[PDB]
Design an enzyme around this catalytic site. Structure first.
Site, mmCIF file in Angstrom:
data_model
loop_
_atom_site.group_PDB
_atom_site.id
_atom_site.type_symbol
_atom_site.label_atom_id
_atom_site.label_comp_id
_atom_site.label_asym_id
_atom_site.label_seq_id
_atom_site.Cartn_x
_atom_site.Cartn_y
_atom_site.Cartn_z
ATOM 1 N N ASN A 186 -59.902 18.592 71.471
ATOM 2 C CA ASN A 186 -59.906 18.113 70.079
ATOM 3 C C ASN A 186 -59.524 16.638 69.947
ATOM 4 O O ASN A 186 -59.177 16.201 68.847
ATOM 5 C CB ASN A 186 -58.973 18.965 69.211
ATOM 6 C CG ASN A 186 -59.239 20.445 69.336
ATOM 7 O OD1 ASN A 186 -58.373 21.227 69.749
ATOM 8 N ND2 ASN A 186 -60.462 20.854 69.019
ATOM 9 N N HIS A 188 -56.882 15.132 70.951
ATOM 10 C CA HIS A 188 -55.440 14.921 70.774
ATOM 11 C C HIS A 188 -54.765 14.824 72.147
ATOM 12 O O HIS A 188 -55.202 15.507 73.073
ATOM 13 C CB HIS A 188 -54.802 16.096 70.017
ATOM 14 C CG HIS A 188 -55.233 16.201 68.591
ATOM 15 N ND1 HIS A 188 -54.669 15.409 67.607
ATOM 16 C CD2 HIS A 188 -56.173 16.999 68.028
ATOM 17 C CE1 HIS A 188 -55.284 15.742 66.481
ATOM 18 N NE2 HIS A 188 -56.202 16.693 66.686
ATOM 19 N N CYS A 223 -48.682 11.193 69.533
ATOM 20 C CA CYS A 223 -49.082 9.876 70.010
ATOM 21 C C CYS A 223 -50.606 9.797 69.828
ATOM 22 O O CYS A 223 -51.332 10.677 70.295
ATOM 23 C CB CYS A 223 -48.676 9.666 71.468
ATOM 24 S SG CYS A 223 -49.390 8.184 72.246
#
Ligand SMILES: C[C@@H]1CCCN(C(=O)c2cscn2)CC1
Ligand SMILES: C[C@@H]1CCCN(C(=O)c2cscn2)CC1
Lengths: 265, 265
Positions: A186, A188, A223
């Site tokens: 995804n 991330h 992050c």
């Protein structure tokens, strides 16, 4: 892997690969963390998930890790088989806990154990929300009803409060950036990358003379793919203890905090 | 995994893990490269190569080092699929050895990818590459097929084409890349797969979202030290084709050069 007889937990065997081990020819704690992730995904897929429900997908809600706690007694060697049993348990409206037991495939002895706390969050607004009763009922049937804790201890290291590192840090690793391999499906940053970034500020001398026994990591902020991180460490102590802090290279915004415990080889 | 009936090649099946796949839920080329490495180590272990050095090579402080890697992927395996990889070695005279792979679908048996790599002998202390002696060549010829067996038989193909040096200014770039402990192997050297990930860091995300990586040829010129910093450079040379260059952030010393070929989704 397969769900156990009662369908209330899941087990999977993994052979340790060549690229997964460290300088001592035994699997790294990041490889262990990746294996915990893999058996967790397979447990969720086996009980009809893809770990969202139709009510969570309807409300744009997701499960997010708040804390991860890993304790390793013996790291598996390259070529060994390790069996991991995992399960979930509800913790009321706070969220769910997911625990793991790592065993030797030959002896059956416990070589490691882990626990993690997860909270419900809105995917778009990033706003945490307590678990609604309707969402709870949907997954309660896949968890044991009586408490089953990987860390039962009257007062264990898994539930200790972690303080914030004070400047100046004793050790530091500056300018850490994630690459495409650090991202999940995804886009991330993978929760395991933070473990690797925390350990980057530990001096190589500790790494060559000690073995990582315990690690507790709090997740405060994500992050971004284009963010830069600073990794900070200070010794807080036959045993070595450290206090950790991950923050944004620029403004110094907190993304993670943790503690590690190392024992002499 | 196991050696084939004739003991002249090795096969291994891998299930694709959750953390091993990209944004389109199919294994990354770095995961593929790691799987090629794993089946290569297991083939070497099964024919008497302990923790790919011989007793004569150990005595003379000689090692095998990759000079070139060439991967071609037709279909990337999806998360949860099983992929079977068959690998083998072949001598190329005094130059060194070649190691090839065939990737197949476990259900259909169709070829979904193939790879070839060239390896040379090097003194592990002086870094001086030498030709394959004689006492060494005979020690391993018995584990390789005698008649030629090529993953890339085509006369005048991509795996053997000469790669030129990227001219400044580069069209795209990713600068300040540093390896972390997860990028190192069991001997504290940077893993050959990390270079693939670093090469691809300078490819624009626009290409990554609209295209799939079909081909990649990577020449290995110099090792990146644990404390070195690397710049990744790319220029479009056109389907999309790119020319790549990895170099030391400071002085601009060459460590790698390659080419990629991408197809539209
Ligand atoms: C057995 C279990 C039921 C709870 C939800 N779940 C998870 O994996 C999960 C972990 S954190 C929040 N959700 C899927 C399968
Ligand atoms: C079957 C094979 C033959 C000799 C070389 N070898 C390698 O693994 C090797 C050397 S360079 C790339 N691969 C060990 C076992």
């Amino acid at each position: 892997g397969s769900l156990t007889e009662d369908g209330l937990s899941y087990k999977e065997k993994f052979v340790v690969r060549s690229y997964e081990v460290g300088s001592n020819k035994t699997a790294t704690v990041e490889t262990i963390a990746n294996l915990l992730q893999e058996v967790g995904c397979n447990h969720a897929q086996s009980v009809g998930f893809s770990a969202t429900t139709t009510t969570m997908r309807k409300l744009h809600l997701i499960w997010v890790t708040a804390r991860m706690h890993i304790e390793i007694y013996k790291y598996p060697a390259w070529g060994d088989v390790v069996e991991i049993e995992t399960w979930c348990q509800s913790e009321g409206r706070i969220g769910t806990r997911r625990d793991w037991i790592l065993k030797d495939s030959v002896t059956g002895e416990v070589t490691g154990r882990a626990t993690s706390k997860w909270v419900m969050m809105n995917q778009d607004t990033r706003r945490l929300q307590k678990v609604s009763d309707d969402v709870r009922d949907e997954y309660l049937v896949f968890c044991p009803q009586e408490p089953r804790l990987a860390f039962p201890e009257e007062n264990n290291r898994s539930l200790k409060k972690i303080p914030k590192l004070e400047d100046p840090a004793q050790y530091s690793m500056i300018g850490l950036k994630p690459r495409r391999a650090d991202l999940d499906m995804n886009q991330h940053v993978n929760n395991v990358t933070y473990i690797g970034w925390v350990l980057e500020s530990i001096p190589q001398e500790i790494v060559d003379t000690h073995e990582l026994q315990v690690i507790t990591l709090d997740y405060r902020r994500e992050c971004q793919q284009d963010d830069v991180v600073d990794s900070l460490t200070t010794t807080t102590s036959n045993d070595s203890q450290f206090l950790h802090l991950l923050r944004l290279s620029g403004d110094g915004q907190e993304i993670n905090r943790g503690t590690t415990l190392w024992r002499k080889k």
